[PDB]
Write a protein that binds this DNA or RNA. Structure first.
Ligand code: 1FZ
Ligand code: CL
Ligand code: MG
Ligand code: NI
Length: 417
DNA sequence: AGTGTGAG
DNA sequence: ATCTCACACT
């Protein structure tokens, strides 16, 4: 149950090269041939952001060497990418997924699912008899097939898993996970049938393990990670690959303890971890290296902030007053469009406008931030309000010159009510 | 409460 | 992602 962190059934669904698939649905000639999606940029034909798996075999990567490669491009608006098409496809899939169990949309192409309830309901409604392997055509059970080889090995491991599953104990963690994988198999089948899109999934007891499991067998495949498989999986799992350990905390763990893999954290005591990383982080690390994590999947859905920004690196850095005013207006117009849709869809209005900037030479993400009331959904008014609070923040008193220059402009609406 | 951190 | 959004922290 909770002592061993097997209290829930969590899944992570991530679309395989989502943007590529969205383009392939519109232009058929691109569906089963190596292609990519570019943003029109005069350097190299434009930067690549989404690459199909077919092209990855040739060594093609995102951010040329596959002459057959076909290209599709993102519409551009106000100097940045326009992702409306993708947001609409994301919403489509999310609505389809919400039918099988409640979800937490985590990004434009992936979402967590809490199947605990659905798994309980499914074991009851089920006769109570066994689960045939035919319900898991694309499920991999991690670590088991120990002791054409791609396919089939999966089926042997699946057979050993099913042959060792509890039959009578309906609260058996492994059984709950197996049923969760069945439900995910159905969910993905429905998604493909109704949209044509393929995706991958991870099934485990918490968000961290579900996210890690999803990437174990991509694409169009799903992986089940049991509590018993956690030690082996962590034995050579880079610390920085765990959700929330990708930044300074993870690097700090590596440097202070002189370790690289998650499983090595098992050798330290809870008191040791608290004495080196603090009470909260020490306990979190102690349980996570053992496969235990409790972050709940939250259906809550309306956003707490709505905003947009744009970066101007190096040469492009905003130098004149005219430039900063124009880009603030562009940002406020995009903001107005989105806030308008927000108010139409959720009957709420933003009461605060946050303005943030970054000056060339500053290592921090943002050089400063100020705020002001957001009374009217007027791009022109908002542009002047943001400009007014940030305008005195300039060193050059020389006219027609902004000093220091700006390398980033950010506008954000919050405090909804 | 604004700053800093982290995911995707 | 070579942008949007969440939230922990005296
Ligand atoms: C990580 C990342 C994603 N994206 C965009 C393009 C992807 O289609 C979209 C989905 O992000 P992802 O889930 O991280 N990667 P993917 O879905 O495209 O590919 P896959 O899951 O590894 O097969 O986000 C970038 O433009 N730059 C990036 O660095
Ligand atoms: Cl903010
Ligand atoms: Mg993906
Ligand atoms: Ni004006």
């Amino acid at each position: 149950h909770m002592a061993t962190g097997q209290d829930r059934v969590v899944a992570l669904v991530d679309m395989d090269c989502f943007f590529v698939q969205v383009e392939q649905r519109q232009n058929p000639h691109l569906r089963n041939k190596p292609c990519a999606v570019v943003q029109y940029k005069s350097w190299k034909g434009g930067g690549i952001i989404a690459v199909s798996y077919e092209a990855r075999a040739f060594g093609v990567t995102r951010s040329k060497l596959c002459p057959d490669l076909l290209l599709a491009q993102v519409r551009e608006s106000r100097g940045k990418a326009n992702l409306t098409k993708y947001r609409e496809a994301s919403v489509e899939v999310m609505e389809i997924m919400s039918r099988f169990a409640v979800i937490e949309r985590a990004s434009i192409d992936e979402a967590y699912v809490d199947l605990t309830s659905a798994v309980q309901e499914r074991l009851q409604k089920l006769q109570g008899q066994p689960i045939s392997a035919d319900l898991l055509p694309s499920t991999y059970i991690e670590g088991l097939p120990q002791g054409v080889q791609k396919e089939g090995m999966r089926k042997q491991g699946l057979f050993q898993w099913l042959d060792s599953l509890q039959i009578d104990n309906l609260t058996s963690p492994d059984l709950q996970l197996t049923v969760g994988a069945v439900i995910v198999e159905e969910m993905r089948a429905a998604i493909e049938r109704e949209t044509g899109f393929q995706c991958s999934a991870g099934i485990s007891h918490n968000k961290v393990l579900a996210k890690l499991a999803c990437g174990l067998n991509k694409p169009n495949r799903q992986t089940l990670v049991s509590h018993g498989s956690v030690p082996q999986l962590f034995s050579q799992m880079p610390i920085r690959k765990i959700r929330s350990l990708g930044g300074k905390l993870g690097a700090s763990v590596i440097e202070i303890l002189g370790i690289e893999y998650m499983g090595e954290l098992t050798q330290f005591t809870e008191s040791q971890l608290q004495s080196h990383f603090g009470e909260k982080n020490g306990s979190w690390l102690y349980a996570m290296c053992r496969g235990i994590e409790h972050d709940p999947v939250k259906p809550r859905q309306l956003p707490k902030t709505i905003g947009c920004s744009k970066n101007f690196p190096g040469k492009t850095a905003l130098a004149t007053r005219e430039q900063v005013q124009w880009w603030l207006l562009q940002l406020a117009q995009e903001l107005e469009e989105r806030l308008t849709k927000d108010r139409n869809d959720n009957d709420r209005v933003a009461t605060q406008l946050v303005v943030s900037i970054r000056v060339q030479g500053d290592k921090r993400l943002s050089s400063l931030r100020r705020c002001c009331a957001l009374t009217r959904y007027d791009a022109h008014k908002m542009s002047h309000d943001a400009f007014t609070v940030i305008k005195n923040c300039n060193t050059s008193g020389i006219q027609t010159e902004w000093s220091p220059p700006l390398t980033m402009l950010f506008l954000c609406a919050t405090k909804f009510s």
